Amino acid sequence: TAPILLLDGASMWFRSYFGVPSSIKAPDGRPVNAVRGFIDAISTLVTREKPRRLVVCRDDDWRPQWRVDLIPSYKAHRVAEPEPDGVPDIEEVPDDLTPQVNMILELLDAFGIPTAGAAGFEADDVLGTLSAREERDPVVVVSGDRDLLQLVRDEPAPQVRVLYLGRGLAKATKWGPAEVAEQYGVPLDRAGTAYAELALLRGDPSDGLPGVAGIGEKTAASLLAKHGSLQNILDAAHDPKSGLSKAHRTKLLGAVDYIAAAETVVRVATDAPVTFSTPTDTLPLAAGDPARVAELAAAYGVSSSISRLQTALDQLP
Ligand SMILES: [Mn+2]
Ligand SMILES: [Mn+2]
Ligand SMILES: [Mn+2]
Ligand SMILES: [Mn+2]
């Protein structure tokens, strides 16, 4: 069957902001380069993958306080203004990108393209929850964030693949457990979960996570190779009988609190209370409110992108 496409919205409209020139502007003079690029990427995906279901996953909280309470450095270098409990912090985002996010969300709502979010959770969690719950169609998670490689799956069916945007959508290929194992040296049988454990130990500078001091990616891969899982590694460190080196024991035991805190920070939630903006995740074949879509697209200077999208949808079986 055709796959369900799960889109990491913010990953994609940040890419379009940096991938489309800012001289692409609305009639009021505001840049719409991210709007155009994001709509164009949806059209490209629709034509390439021919889904019947598609969801744009939102960051209802791009930096959830429950993660920050466990590891205060988490995404701290990306905060423009911290906000008190219950209110998402203000992310450091170019001043001419934030209005384009609002424009994109208005167009998606008027067209009726499903969007999904969960209060207090990241789009990463929405993605992990929807991919974990899927039972009918193969899943393609579309994102430039390597965090989502932890979702890859072969069994139980359906499979989950990450269409990884690190080199842009044109060069993007689908990553599964084999690709993650081959590229990161984690065990194939649990590649996705092992990748999150590897990332935990080695660190994640874009998210402000230091990892375990003195455990780089090569040491983390060999420890997972020998012991199979992070829990087995911790067990090997806690048991003075094991063949774990004394130096590795010292590094791991010195970080027991960080490792416990980081496990829940690094792993995407798989049971977030996701809500849809639409009744189903079915991709509409024409605008739910075509007058409002034409008005918005004219005002936002992306009328031709919307026309190309409706062409792509017209070509679906
Ligand atoms: Mn806050
Ligand atoms: Mn994210
Ligand atoms: Mn991360
Ligand atoms: Mn992330």
From TrEMBL:
Keyword Magnesium: no
Keywords in alphabetical order: DNA-binding, Exonuclease, Hydrolase, Metal-binding, Nuclease
Alphabetical GO biological process terms: DNA replication, Okazaki fragment processing
5'-3' exonuclease domain: residues covered: 2-284
GO MF annotation terms: 5'-3' exonuclease activity; 5'-flap endonuclease activity; DNA binding; metal ion binding
Annotated binding of Mn(2+) 3, by residue: D124, D145, D147, D207
Annotated residues for binding of Mn(2+) 1: E83, D89
Alphabetical list of PANTHER family matching this protein: 5'-3' EXONUCLEASE FAMILY PROTEIN (PTHR42646:SF2), FLAP ENDONUCLEASE XNI (PTHR42646)
Protein known as: 5'-3' exonuclease
Known role: 5'-3' exonuclease acting preferentially on double-stranded DNA.
InterPro entries named among the record's database cross-references: 5-3_exonucl_a-hlix_arch_N, 5-3_exonuclease, 5-3_exonuclease_C_sf, DNA_polI_H3TH, FEN, HhH2, PIN-like_dom_sf
Lineage of producing organism: Bacteria, Bacillati, Actinomycetota, Actinomycetes, Mycobacteriales
Taxonomic superkingdom: Bacteria
Coiled-coil regions, chain positions: none
Binding site for Mn(2+) 4: D147, D204, D207
Residue positions binding Mn(2+) 2: D124, D145
DNA-binding in keyword set: yes
